[PDB]
Design a protein around this ligand. Structure first.
Ligand SMILES: [Mg+2]
Ligand SMILES: [Mg+2]
Ligand SMILES: [Mg+2]
Ligand SMILES: [Mg+2]
Ligand SMILES: [Mg+2]
Ligand SMILES: [Mg+2]
Ligand SMILES: [Mg+2]
Ligand SMILES: [Mg+2]
Ligand SMILES: [Mg+2]
Ligand SMILES: [Mg+2]
Ligand SMILES: [Mg+2]
Ligand SMILES: [Mg+2]
Ligand SMILES: [Mg+2]
Ligand SMILES: [Mg+2]
Ligand SMILES: [Mg+2]
Ligand SMILES: [Mg+2]
Ligand SMILES: [Mg+2]
Ligand SMILES: [Mg+2]
Ligand SMILES: [Mg+2]
Ligand SMILES: [Mg+2]
Ligand SMILES: [Mg+2]
Ligand SMILES: [Mg+2]
Ligand SMILES: [Mg+2]
Ligand SMILES: [Mg+2]
Ligand SMILES: [Mg+2]
Ligand SMILES: [Mg+2]
Ligand SMILES: [Mg+2]
Ligand SMILES: [Mg+2]
Ligand SMILES: [Mg+2]
Ligand SMILES: [Mg+2]
Ligand SMILES: [Mg+2]
Ligand SMILES: [Mg+2]
Ligand SMILES: [Mg+2]
Ligand SMILES: [Mg+2]
Ligand SMILES: [Mg+2]
Ligand SMILES: [Mg+2]
Ligand SMILES: [Mg+2]
Lengths: 58, 345
């Protein structure tokens, strides 16, 4: 979902450098930059709301 | 036990366990339904199979086994082998198209899910179109058919949510139903509204006269082309029928249908009529010329009611000639031996 939002990982291989400052000394994004269930051409196709943790017994 | 409560509880319980969140769940499902469409179509494109076929096979795999295909739609899709063949090509679709298959099913499911969740919406709606002449369950059911209709056309791209959308698509389904089934003798929607306007108008007219409007007022107040003959006619159609089986007179044990007489059936008098009439008409028909007598006997008594087109090859002059001369010798000798005079009719 968020992959395309921050173009860094879906556009080129930059999800590793997305980990900000300690990389100089599977998904791993920035410290905390996005807060919506959207599509980011321009923050247009969105849906900012709740987040379920539905346990499927399977 | 009693039927309204059980269904009410039936869907209310499922909504109670799964209402759809305002935005999220309706968005989610919506998105899946559409992708299903785009999927099925693209499936049609790569399989050459009609989107109708792709649609029913994903339905069977998600909604029901051979059981649901065999009883509902009689038998053209082989219960097992047929649909299966279709699922096999769907599997063969590599990584790229297989994706559409997997999506189509998931989309089909979501659909049903959205439909389930928005059933309270129907009943809440259908609740007010109650006293129109349809059973509450019948009303909810048509309205239900309406919500399914909405599901087919909602474009999630256009931000508005399914609530307001279903409202319209349901109200239309209901009103139609009300106009198509409510009466024994069907009445088009226009006549219906026509009747409502007539009623409403009679209402505002009752308002001050103290005189149930003569069909004069109703015409006036109604509008452009309303006249007495029109109103007397509409309200005549407005009266629903009466129960052929109704308690009559001292309701003790009276049933309305034993009293209506019968018309096609020849009461004895008529059977005797056709006996002598046919025997005597048959006697005259024999001792004669079969040239213009049978022509007018058959043209008049055998098929339909054409002097020229009445006689075979011989023109009009021999027709009128034998018609009028044989018809009069026949009448004047029948005047002698008076058998026909006493008008059998
Ligand atoms: Mg980081
Ligand atoms: Mg790193
Ligand atoms: Mg560096
Ligand atoms: Mg470090
Ligand atoms: Mg080192
Ligand atoms: Mg953030
Ligand atoms: Mg998201
Ligand atoms: Mg925004
Ligand atoms: Mg969303
Ligand atoms: Mg939130
Ligand atoms: Mg597509
Ligand atoms: Mg191709
Ligand atoms: Mg058949
Ligand atoms: Mg065939
Ligand atoms: Mg089978
Ligand atoms: Mg089986
Ligand atoms: Mg593709
Ligand atoms: Mg009422
Ligand atoms: Mg309303
Ligand atoms: Mg009326
Ligand atoms: Mg009104
Ligand atoms: Mg009346
Ligand atoms: Mg009586
Ligand atoms: Mg009779
Ligand atoms: Mg006879
Ligand atoms: Mg004779
Ligand atoms: Mg003969
Ligand atoms: Mg003869
Ligand atoms: Mg004879
Ligand atoms: Mg004749
Ligand atoms: Mg004839
Ligand atoms: Mg004819
Ligand atoms: Mg001929
Ligand atoms: Mg003559
Ligand atoms: Mg002559
Ligand atoms: Mg004659
Ligand atoms: Mg006389």
């Amino acid at each position: 979902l968020a992959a395309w939002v921050e173009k860094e990982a879906y556009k080129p291989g930059e999800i590793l450098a997305e980990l900000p400052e300690p990389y100089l000394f599977g998904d791993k994004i920035v410290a905390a930059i996005d807060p919506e269930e959207e599509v980011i051409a321009e923050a247009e196709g969105v849906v900012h709301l709740h987040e379920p943790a539905s346990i499927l017994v399977v | 036990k009693i039927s309204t409560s059980d269904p009410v509880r039936q869907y209310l319980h499922e909504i109670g366990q799964v209402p759809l969140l305002t935005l999220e769940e309706e968005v989610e499902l919506a998105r899946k339904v559409e992708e299903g469409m785009e999927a099925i179509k693209k499936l049609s494109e790569i399989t050459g199979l009609d989107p109708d076929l792709i649609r029913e096979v994903v339905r069977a795999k998600i909604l029901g086994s051979a059981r649901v295909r065999h009883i509902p739609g009689l038998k053209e899709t082989l219960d097992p082998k047929t649909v299966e063949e279709i699922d096999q090509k769907l599997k063969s679709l590599p990584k790229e198209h297989k994706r559409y298959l997997h999506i189509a099913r998931e989309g089909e499911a979501a659909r049903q899910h959205l439909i389930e969740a928005n059933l309270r919406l129907v009943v809440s709606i259908a609740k007010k179109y109650t006293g129109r002449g349809l059973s509450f369950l019948d009303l909810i059911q048509e309205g239900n058919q309406g919500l399914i209709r909405a599901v087919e056309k909602f474009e999630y791209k256009r931000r508005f949510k399914f609530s307001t959308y279903a409202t319209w698509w349901i109200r239309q389904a209901i009103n139609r139903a009300i106009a198509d089934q409510a009466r024994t003798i069907r009445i088009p929607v226009h006549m219906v509204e026509t009747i409502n306007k007539l009623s409403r108008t009679a209402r505002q007219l009752q308002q001050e006269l103290g005189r149930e409007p003569t069909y004069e007022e109703i015409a006036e107040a109604m509008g452009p082309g309303w006249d007495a003959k029109r109103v007397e006619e509409t309200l005549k159609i407005a009266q629903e029928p009466v129960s052929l089986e109704t308690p009559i007179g001292d309701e003790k044990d009276s049933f309305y249908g034993d009293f209506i007489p019968d018309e096609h059936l020849p009461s004895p008098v008529d059977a005797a009529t056709q006996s002598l009439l046919s025997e005597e008409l048959e006697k005259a028909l024999s001792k004669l010329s079969e040239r213009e007598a049978m022509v007018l006997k058959l043209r008049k008594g055998l098929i339909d009611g054409e002097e020229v087109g009445a006689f075979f090859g011989v023109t009009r002059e021999r027709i009128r000639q034998i018609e009028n001369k044989a018809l009069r010798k026949l009448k004047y000798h029948e005047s002698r031996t008076r058998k026909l005079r006493d008008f059998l009719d």
